Design a protein around this ligand. Structure first.
Ligand SMILES: Nc1ncnc2c1ncn2[C@@H]1O[C@H](COP(=O)(O)OP(=O)(O)O)[C@@H](O)[C@H]1O
Ligand SMILES: Nc1ncnc2c1ncn2[C@@H]1O[C@H](COP(=O)(O)OP(=O)(O)O)[C@@H](O)[C@H]1O
Ligand SMILES: [Mg+2]
Ligand SMILES: [Mg+2]
Lengths: 174, 443, 444, 181
């Protein structure tokens, strides 16, 4: 697939859209509906732990398949130490190795050594053969980047606002 | 309805900065996994957290650990509002200081032992007033965020200067101690916890709303099983997690005419005084043991008072009574009949999985060497109860200390932090299991 | 010391032709996974098998299932001899016939339904006289190898002509029916089978050698739990797997007899048991004979109880008899019967958990063709509270439903019967009716 | 990397003149006090295991794998043809079904023709060419059957059939190799 690479930076944000979102006291007030809903879950969890059912092969296979059909496309964001975000579309069956290749091909210096990680706590993505589905970088996930001591300068000049990047994602995900 | 309204649920992720939502809820709120969110409870104290997806919770749920709940001053079941928080600036500088009662007996470089590794490229979101927990050196230290720049929250980035000079600060009364017993302190009772929550959470948590749904509250509950299975622990956690006041009655102590029924009455009066409350009678059999024959024998004056106090508590009082005993048969049947201790839960001997969970709880604060195999330890502890396992871990820690010695009322943090507990230390503890130094409080 | 001397143990692998050794034992005998092996027991009947390794064998163990045990006339614990047999030539032709009491109710092409899929590129080693079992069309059919060419053993290869014309044959006296109950008929009771085997196996199987070890055998064992959890199943399986004689006494049935007649039938049971020793006497519903009663002034101990106690106390070790009793709760029974030397051992045969139910469902579907949509784990999850008898009934009902969806007589054609697939819908049907017909169909 | 050291044998090349193994005495089959003690001991520890219900630990699983791979660094495979010819070859446990198929292909008379590999009984086709011999339990010595959709009776390269050896000579070749030689 084509990644449709895009770069955004929080200093390019142009909107202060709708701030006085003052929230009423009763929003936080628990209703009879709320209490009943909690009890249901408790009853439900009591029954399950008493009956100790099997987690079935068919259920496990159904969840995998149901999630891979629900999210055929993956949007990833690699956040740089200078707060630049590189955004790219992927498929869930693609690997962490592919992500690294995406990053490398958009670096100012492609020979420079880097590591990708999620946080918190800091967890490096070492297994390059691990898929994005297995890595849980799916359906939309934020990844950080670090180096031992970066994005192509031409690409920084076409950087957009984060909120603009968001709408690109929403539109791609339908 | 309103998609930003969520219900606080227990967490699977132990990390301070992490909350979890169902994937459909994240889709709805257009949230990336690993993204920053802003949270508020009814007290309106806000928190900034990182959001992850969780496969087991329903759409309206937000899974958060106790550190986050305390910061938001919420409890399990409370409402929070969620809004995306993309606008989080990297801190120029921050100030954090330890809570005094967590750092007693410790001296030296707190920054290097606790703070530096905790924040190191973790990009943690933090808010002025936040209390957070760093584990290490057989200890759990609590820190408070005194100031941030910019205010009132920021990301702790590599470039953020972390200041931490100053005096350890006093705990506030509104600030719940994280040393208080919670659900996350209990292992191998996932079933029994659920059974107890189902019965008491709602009546204790929302008395007014509970009575409105018609169902009658449990009068008295009987927890049974051998000593040290966690009966006190469970009742304590339920009280703490529901906000309920907790009163412990020690059966044997009360039984050692006259002053006994004075204590019993006052205990009950103090409970409804501070309602909603749990009254916990440890070793009920000491007070009301099963009597043989005794046909024309008068009921004991103590047993009578107890029935009076128990029958004299209407749903209105907001009190639930819990009792520990080994076997329900050791109790007088007058207490075990409806309107009294009509409900019972077995807190029995944990299994292998159960034991592993307990061992994981009581090693939380220890640095363990790579060779430490807690599963092996679980396998070699058949028959052990929670208390045996806590003692075992304590013996293993002391064995590590013995091997290293240092003496005083004070230890250096870096010294204390270099203590690795090895498998050989557990083998020692294992060999000594048969069911000192002030700078160290062991579990 | 004697590497080729092995001790019979129970199979994990349920294929007829397969036996299992520990890898270090296979190293020692220089065997390949898949090699043919020649086996002999005490009666010195031979069998030929394929050998696999097993991670859970002790070095002296040979794991084998009931088909091979019967062919060898051995039982769990017995000695066998192992030798390599790479000589085995490929069969020109074989003659196999069904055993009569296994094919009642069926007609048609037994080759197409059972024999063809069984031998199909399986390269199975066989011996003249072997009895083997094939599952299919709601039924387990037993076949005997009447003759082979070459004789007496060969490999059934693709070119081997399989002849099966002729009348069904009579079961021989020492030839045990594989329909008889054994350990492989019990699910969800691993723990309890182990507890019971530890108590009774050696006393019943090797009485003289057992005495020489000096430890005292149990006299009475109390099996307890709700109806249909497999208490009779277990006692019967232990009797069969040990070779011990089995005498069943039904509690209410013996109490229905007139005063005097009860006591005599009780005595006859014990005499019969002592006579055919080693033996198991099984008292179903012990509480019907000796219930726990309330203390009434001047109450005389029931004649029948006195008689049972006399019989228990009178069974010396040298009688080689063990008494098993089934009750719902241990407290339902006269405490006199539970004192040392009587029923002083008790084993909880309770309600099965999800894993237990799965195992039980797999046992009771093993003769059925299940469609790919059949999910027995799901069925197990939906049967919390069901015991063994509930689950066996459920499987009969799902199968009866499949038959109703298709087809009446006392005879069915093998190919028709074999085309039956029980579906998940059939189970859902059986589930909706579950609340804990035709002659040619035998249901468990 | 691994010397396959390929050989072919046929059962029709065994000698058939030497004596049978000596018949066993009746005492061989007779159970002793010692046998009964060992059986009891096994029953006792199986009962315990089932009562305690220990965990099967990660460390245990990993050590079991590690020990097996160290104990058997070399694998002897035998592929059995419809005509009863056997091709024998040495492999590593970490090599694959695909490697096995390649090996078989290397020694076929018509390298183009289609074949499948299976284990029995029951017939179980080796369809996953990526599966390692360890995973497939073709280890440490295993016997595999060969089948072809159109059984045209050539299969093996006829030059190799000239040098076919006895089954028991093939066994010796395996024993020598497995003692690391
Ligand atoms: N299920 C458990 N999980 C973790 N720790 C436990 C558990 N049960 C017991 N313990 C440990 O043993 C100590 C004593 O337990 P306690 O609640 O007094 O048991 P009981 O009331 O049943 O005698 C607890 O403070 C705790 O450290
Ligand atoms: N544990 C089990 N495994 C397999 N089948 C069982 C089991 N328990 C019961 N059954 C089936 O149902 C019947 C149960 O009857 P029975 O053994 O008499 O139970 P109980 O003795 O407890 O009354 C058995 O004949 C068998 O077909
Ligand atoms: Mg106690
Ligand atoms: Mg019955």
């Amino acid at each position: 697939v084509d990644r449709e690479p895009v770069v955004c930076h929080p200093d390019l944000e142009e909107r202060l859209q709708a701030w006085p979102a003052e929230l009423p006291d009763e929003f936080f007030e628990l209703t009879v509906d709320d209490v009943r809903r909690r009890l249901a879950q408790l009853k439900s969890e009591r029954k399950r732990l008493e009956e100790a059912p099997l987690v079935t092969k068919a259920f496990r296979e159904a969840q995998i398949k149901e999630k891979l059909e629900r999210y055929p496309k993956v949007a990833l964001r690699v956040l740089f130490p200078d707060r630049y975000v590189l955004q790219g579309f992927f498929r869930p069956s693609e690997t962490v190795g592919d992500l690294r290749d995406f990053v490398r091909s958009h670096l100012g210096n492609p020979e420079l050594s880097f590591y990708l990680f999620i946080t918190p706590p800091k967890t490096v993505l070492d297994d390059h053969t691990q898929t994005l589905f297995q890595a849980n970088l799916f359906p939309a996930a934020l990844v950080h980047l670090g180096a031992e001591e970066y994005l192509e300068p031409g690409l920084l000049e076409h950087a957009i606002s984060p909120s603009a990047a968001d709408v690109l994602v929403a539109r791609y995900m339908s | 309805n309103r998609p930003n309204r969520l219900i606080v649920d227990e967490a699977i992720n132990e990390d301070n900065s992490v909350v979890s939502l169902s994937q459909p809820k994240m889709d709805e709120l257009q949230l990336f996994r690993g993204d920053t969110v802003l949270l508020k409870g009814k007290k309106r104290r806000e928190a900034v957290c990182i959001v992850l997806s969780d496969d087991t919770c329903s759409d309206e749920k937000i899974r958060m650990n106790r550190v986050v709940r305390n910061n938001l001053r919420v409890r399990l079941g409370d409402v929070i509002s969620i809004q995306p928080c993309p606008d989080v600036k990297y801190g120029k500088r921050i100030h954090v200081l330890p809570i005094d009662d967590t750092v007693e007996g410790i001296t030296g470089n707190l920054f290097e032992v606790y703070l530096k590794p905790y924040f190191l490229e973790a990009y943690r979101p933090i808010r002025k007033g936040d209390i957070f927990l760093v584990r290490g050196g057989m200890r759990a230290v609590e820190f408070k965020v005194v100031e941030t720049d910019p205010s009132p929250y920021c990301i702790v980035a590599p470039d953020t200067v972390i200041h931490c000079e100053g005096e350890p600060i006093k705990r506030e009364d509104e600030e719940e101690s994280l040393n208080e017993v919670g659900y996350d302190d209990i292992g191998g009772c996932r079933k029994q916890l659920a059974q107890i929550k189902e019965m008491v959470e709602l009546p204790l948590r929302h008395p007014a709303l509970f009575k409105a749904i018609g169902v009658k509250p449990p009068r008295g509950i009987l927890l049974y099983g051998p000593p040290g299975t966690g009966k006190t622990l469970i009742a304590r956690a339920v009280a703490n997690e529901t906000g309920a006041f907790f009163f412990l009655i020690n059966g044997p102590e009360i039984m050692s005419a006259g002053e006994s029924e004075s204590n019993l009455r006052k205990a009950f009066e103090e409970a409804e005084k501070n309602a909603p409350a749990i009254i916990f009678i440890d070793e009920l059999d000491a007070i009301a043991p099963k009597r043989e024959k005794t046909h024309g024998e008068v009921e004991r004056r103590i047993v009578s008072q107890l029935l009076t106090l128990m029958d004299g508590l209407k749903q209105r009082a907001h009190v639930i009574v819990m009792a520990a005993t080994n076997r329900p048969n050791s109790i007088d049947p007058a207490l075990r009949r409806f309107g009294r201790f009509d409900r019972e839960v077995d807190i029995g001997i944990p299994d292998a999985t159960g034991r592993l969970e307990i061992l994981q709880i009581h090693t939380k604060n220890m640095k363990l060497a790579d060779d430490v195999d807690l599963e092996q330890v679980a396998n070699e502890t058949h028959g052990h109860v929670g208390a045996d396992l806590a003692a075992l871990c304590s013996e293993a820690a002391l064995q590590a200390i013995r091997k290293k010695m240092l003496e005083d009322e004070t230890i250096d943090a870096e010294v204390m932090n270099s203590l690795a507990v090895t498998m050989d230390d557990f083998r020692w503890a294992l060999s000594q299991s048969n069911p000192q130094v002030t700078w160290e409080d062991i579990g």
